């Protein structure tokens, strides 16, 4: 369950303060596919990145 109010509407830098589990719950894969180009400019950790990469493989 994405916490109330916390669902990602853009792939932007305020996602850096999402926990691994919150990324998984709050970031729809479609969204992420279309704003893929943003990710490599956001200072994500290797752990956060693992989760985002898992999302895109769901697809």
């Amino acid at each position, epitope marked *: 369950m994405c916490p109330s109010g916390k669902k990602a509407r853009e792939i932007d830098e305020s996602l*850096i303060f999402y926990k*691994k589990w919150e990324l998984e719950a709050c970031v729809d894969a479609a969204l992420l596919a279309t704003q893929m180009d943003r990710v490599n400019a956001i200072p994500f950790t290797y752990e956060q990145l693992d989760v985002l990469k898992h999302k895109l493989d769901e697809l």
Partner: antibody
Amino acid sequence: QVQLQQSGPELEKPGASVKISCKASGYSFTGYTMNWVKQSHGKSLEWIGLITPYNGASSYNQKFRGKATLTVDKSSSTAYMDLLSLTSEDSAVYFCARGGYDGRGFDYWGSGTPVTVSS
Amino acid sequence: DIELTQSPAIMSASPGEKVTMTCSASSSVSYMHWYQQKSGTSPKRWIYDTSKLASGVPGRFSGSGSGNSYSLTISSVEAEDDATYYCQQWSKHPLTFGSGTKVEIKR
């Protein structure tokens, strides 16, 4: 043991810039974000911004955009912060602090670099 | 930006007492972390993810809170707890800190 060794006290004239540094040992530098914090003598803490050393991506507190520039040198596991066009309101102690795994706050902090801006 | 209001600003505590300090956030926070700083030292991560003991922290420290009101509790105060404790929200960019609750020890 994880260690963040910051550079010594600086003294700079209003309008000059200064580059302070933070050398990390005891872990995998690219495994963790590195953060910078400012504390004004006798005051609270403000987050300046952070950076992931692997690719150099970074993110800043708007208030510090322009004032500060974060960079790293992976091959010496050193992180740097450039402070530009200094005024007396930049006189403060600046810390680096490693972000704990998966967002668990700042789990290791450096000793602090005191910077004094005066004529 | 999320505004953190810590209270009391100065807490004075007799050793053995149980005491709680609060951090109100101006809006909703997912996790709060707390740091202890003693005059002239780097801050030290004390409680993280709202309620978990950071490494090496004595068991008498705890944390709780939901949504807007977070608290840090010392279940039995001791001479060495004299310090300033800062909360920090880890929820909305940019990260913000309270201005600290300072704990002074009664003797």
